[PDB]
Amino acid sequence: ITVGPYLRLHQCGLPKKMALELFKPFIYGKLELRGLATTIKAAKKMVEREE
Amino acid sequence: HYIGDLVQRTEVELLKTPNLGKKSLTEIKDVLASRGLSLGMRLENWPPAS
Amino acid sequence: DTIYTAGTPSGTSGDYIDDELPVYQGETTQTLQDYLMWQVELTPFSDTDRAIATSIVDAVDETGYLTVPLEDILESIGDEEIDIDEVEAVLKRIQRFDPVGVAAKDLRDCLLIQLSQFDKTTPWLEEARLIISDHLDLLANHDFRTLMRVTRLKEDVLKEAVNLIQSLDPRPGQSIQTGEPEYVIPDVLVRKHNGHWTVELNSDSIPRLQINQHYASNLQDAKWLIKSLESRNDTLLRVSRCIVEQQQAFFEQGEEYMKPMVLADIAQAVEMHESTISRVTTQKYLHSPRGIFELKYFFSSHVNTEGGGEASSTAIRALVKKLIAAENPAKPLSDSKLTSLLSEQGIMVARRTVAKYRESLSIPPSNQRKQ
Numbered sequence: 001i002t003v004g005p006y007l008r009l010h011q012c013g014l015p016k017k018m019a020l021e022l023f024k025p026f027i028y029g030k031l032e033l034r035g036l037a038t039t040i041k042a043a044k045k046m047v048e049r050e051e
Numbered sequence: 052h053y054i055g056d057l058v059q060r061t062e063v064e065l066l067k068t069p070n071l072g073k074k075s076l077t078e079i080k081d082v083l084a085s086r087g088l089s090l091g092m093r094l095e096n097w098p099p100a101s
Numbered sequence: 102d103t104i105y106t107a108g109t110p111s112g113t114s115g116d117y118i119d120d121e122l123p124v125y126q127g128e129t130t131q132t133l134q135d136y137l138m139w140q141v142e143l144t145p146f147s148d149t150d151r152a153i154a155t156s157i158v159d160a161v162d163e164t165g166y167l168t169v170p171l172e173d174i175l176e177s178i179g180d181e182e183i184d185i186d187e188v189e190a191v192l193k194r195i196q197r198f199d200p201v202g203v204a205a206k207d208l209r210d211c212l213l214i215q216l217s218q219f220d221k222t223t224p225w226l227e228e229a230r231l232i233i234s235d236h237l238d239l240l241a242n243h244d245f246r247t248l249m250r251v252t253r254l255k256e257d258v259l260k261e262a263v264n265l266i267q268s269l270d271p272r273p274g275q276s277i278q279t280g281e282p283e284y285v286i287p288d289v290l291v292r293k294h295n296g297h298w299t300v301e302l303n304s305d306s307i308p309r310l311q312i313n314q315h316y317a318s319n320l321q322d323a324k325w326l327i328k329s330l331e332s333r334n335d336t337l338l339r340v341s342r343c344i345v346e347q348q349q350a351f352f353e354q355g356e357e358y359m360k361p362m363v364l365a366d367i368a369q370a371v372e373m374h375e376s377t378i379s380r381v382t383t384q385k386y387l388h389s390p391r392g393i394f395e396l397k398y399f400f401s402s403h404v405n406t407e408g409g410g411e412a413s414s415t416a417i418r419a420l421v422k423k424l425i426a427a428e429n430p431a432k433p434l435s436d437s438k439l440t441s442l443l444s445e446q447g448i449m450v451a452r453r454t455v456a457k458y459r460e461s462l463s464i465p466p467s468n469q470r471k472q
Binding site: 074077078080081085090091092 | 145146147184186187189190191193197218
């Protein structure tokens, strides 16, 4: 943990490489929802490549 | 008229379609599964305005 | 009694913190069926479709091929309203999971499934599709001439189509394979010095247990286990040493120099029941400079020798291999000609026995080896 002096009282700073790993199934669902990946394997590959 | 509209239709909805026997529904599922699709998907912001 | 002059270190600390390690539990792993079922769950099926998918994925082997016919699956479902076309639809849906082409009935189906997922811009796709769909044995048998007649195509297009064919995957299910294969530790070692083969048990595998006798019945019973282990390893060493003595020529000059020895010879040599000999040599290996061989490998059948004696079937197999290895590509040797050729050195084996040996060594017959 480091210090962010600019944040507001209800905010925290998260690295995005952690957020990609934590929120992965939500990302799968959102990718499938808008048609970017018709199947689960396509979304998994797209997330793996980090497009 | 487009693949997306057919894709978004659920199987129960197409079962009750008049003049559409179960054989035709199974054939449609076969031709969809051949290409890597299935009945019962869900897309937002459709049609794509084209 | 030598010291290994090179080796690999172990990644760990020499000393551990004094608290006891937790009991072993294990760790789950992902095989092919686990991945396929995971993809099945996240797929918009109905309930009956999911049941059929579970039944299908149950019957997929290690390589990714469907081992049972669809009639077995439809029978296993146990319902009467379900037809075979629903099973076909579910199978077609499953075959497009990752890896593409899994759960395929046979090689032709797998290749066609993989080919159907390309783009039309591919240089030679329809030619490959037609070749797989209709004329497959021609490509396997290396005809290249009647295929040109049937396809009505010149050399270049056919060659490129075959190049595309040999770019696909015939075993799509082996991408998700096991982590690391097991390895076997040899039981006994045979070295050579003084022109003689010394036999010695593996020191790294035989420790001497500390004798717990101080609290002293139980002491006598503990020594009984010691005597039993002593007798066991003594029997193993005696059997291995006798076997090595009998098969000295093979250890020096390799194959084609074995002797047709059976369990009776060992039983009479070590004065023991042949059942014990069968029991002790099972699932035990010996390490030689030539490789690692199971202790039961040196027992085989025999054939009559014209001048006298017998010839090991291993020697006959090796001779057949070495005769085939130096044949003319224009006119490959046939079975009768091979028998006639071997019937000049006192080898007397029937044509049927030659065919059996050839099938065992997995060598195609003469007509498939012609260039």
